[PDB]
Amino acid sequence: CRPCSDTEVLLAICTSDFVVRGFIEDVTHVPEQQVSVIYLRVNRLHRQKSRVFQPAPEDSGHWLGHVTTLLQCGVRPGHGEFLFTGHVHFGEAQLGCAPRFSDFQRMYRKAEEMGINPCEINME
Numbered sequence: 235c236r237p238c239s240d241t242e243v244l245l246a247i248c249t250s251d252f253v254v255r256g257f258i259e260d261v262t263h264v265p266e267q268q269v270s271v272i273y274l275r276v277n278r279l280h281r282q283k284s285r286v287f288q289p290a291p292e293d294s295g296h297w298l299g300h301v302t303t304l305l306q307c308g309v310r311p312g313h314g315e316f317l318f319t320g321h322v323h324f325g326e327a328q329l330g331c332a333p334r335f336s337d338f339q340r341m342y343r344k345a346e347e348m349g350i351n352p353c354e355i356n357m358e
Contacts (some may be wrong), residue, residue: 235304235306235307237331237333238330238331238333240341240345242331243317243319243331243333243338243341244341244342244345244350244351244352245352246319246330246331247280247317247319247342247353247355248352248353250281250319250320250321250330250331251281251282251283251320251321251322251327252281252282252283252286252287252318252319252320252321252322252327253280253281253282253317253318253319253355254274254276254278254279254280254282254287254297254317254318255276255277255278255280255315255316255317255318255335255357255358256274256275256276256277256278256296256297256315256316256318257274257275257277257314257315257316258272258273258274258275258311258312258316259273259274259275259298260272260273261273261308261311263305263308263309264302264305265305268304268305269302269303269304269305269308270302270303270304270305270307270308270309270311271300271301271302271308272300272301272302272303272308272311272329273298273299273300274287274298274299274300274301274318275290275293275296275297275298276296276297276298276299276318277295277296278357278358279297280355280357282322282327283322283327284322284325284327286299286300286301286322286325286326286327287299299327300327301318301320301327301328301329302326302327302328302329303328303329303332307329312334314334314335315334315335315336316332316333316334316335316338317331317332317333317335317338317357318331318332319331319332335357338357339357342355
């Protein structure tokens with residue numbers, strides 16, 4: 235439940251199955267599996283797998299999908315905008331990292347200035 239390190243986030247945006255910017259729509263807990271399901275409204279879709287995220291008809295420019303997280307993380311999900319990264323197995327997305335988006339932007343700009351980011355992304 236510790237946040238990903240900055241190093242982990244920089245690698246994740248290059249190698250993770252999905253990378254999206256967005257916000258939480260709803261949270262449902264699944265105690266039997268000790269996970270929470272986090273429904274996400276995505277406004278920038280950088281990469282994904284297995285069509286986890288699909289267009290929201292009414293809400294132009296946005297996608298909707300859901301990801302799983304350890305229940306310890308889903309009970310204090312937080313507020314605001316995030317960069318979500320993670321992995322897709324058997325059609326189900328599981329969250330890897332979720333820095334606050336404004337924190338991510340600051341970290342990434344510094345990494346880019348240093349030249350240490352292994353890959354480039356532009357989430358606006």
